[PDB]
Amino acid sequence: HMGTEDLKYSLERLREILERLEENPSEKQIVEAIRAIVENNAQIVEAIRAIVEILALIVENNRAIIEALEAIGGGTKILEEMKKQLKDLKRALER
Amino acid sequence: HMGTEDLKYSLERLREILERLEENPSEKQIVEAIRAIVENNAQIVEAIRAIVEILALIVENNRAIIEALEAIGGGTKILEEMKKQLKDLKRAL
Amino acid sequence: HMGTEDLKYSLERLREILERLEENPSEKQIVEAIRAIVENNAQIVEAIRAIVEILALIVENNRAIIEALEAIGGGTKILEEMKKQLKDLKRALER
């Protein structure tokens, strides 16, 4: 559940409120548009959090993949490179 | 990065618009600032959806990698882990 | 991680500003909300840039992985698919 549907929904409601604001500006409509922006930003944060969670799972999957390759046995150099890349991916996500 | 430069540009434009709004908060300038915010957020939604598509492509690539490892290395404990991880990834996307 | 905590808090600050905006939708409160929206967006852009970079690193890691598989098992039909997938991923990251 990446939540892209509700992210899109929140953008469309914001667009509708913007059109009404453009046609008949007022304090009421400015507040309504800012409230819609906040709701759209809320869905953006949720989508970003869900993405970051998937990234962590992918990196864990690659960790297991690289362990399988080590077990099979292979070139020293390529294994060292893959491990270093994995190390940097872990660091990036832990930052 | 992919479209990051466009997002960076749109952000700098918002900062410029904000500075003009701060010294001239007219109704018209407020509406134009809000217009720019929406246009920027539309770009963000687009970039997020593009990221999600790449995540699906990565996960399909890892599915193939794990199949390749099964054919070469056989049935291992580590193979069991990879399949479980992959199943969760496919379910979560 | 990856700034998600800062994004969540930034959203909370926006909501609090919106509460006071609804209380008195003066120009000062409107500009305060818009200034906070821009600051929040700056963090969103930064989070998306960090995400895109991790994506490229993961593709780089998968490229090394497939390099290792070819060195271990030689040419295979699954290797053909994986290299076409990599190229498509590399193309997606440019566009």
Residue numbers in the entry:
A (entry chain C), C (entry chain B): 1 to 95
B (entry chain A): 1 to 93
What does the report in the manuscript say about this coordinate set?
We used de novo protein design to generate very closely related proteins that adopt two very different states—a short state and a long state, like a viral fusion protein—and then created a single molecule that can be found in both forms. Inspired by class I viral fusion proteins, such as influenza hemagglutinin, we chose homotrimeric helical bundles as the fundamental architecture. We decided on a design scheme with two divergent conformations containing a constant six-helix bundle “base” and a variable portion with three inner helices and three “flipping” helices. In the compact “short” state (∼66 Å height), the flipping helices fold back to interact with the inner helices; in the extended “long” state (∼100 Å height), they extend to form interactions with each other.
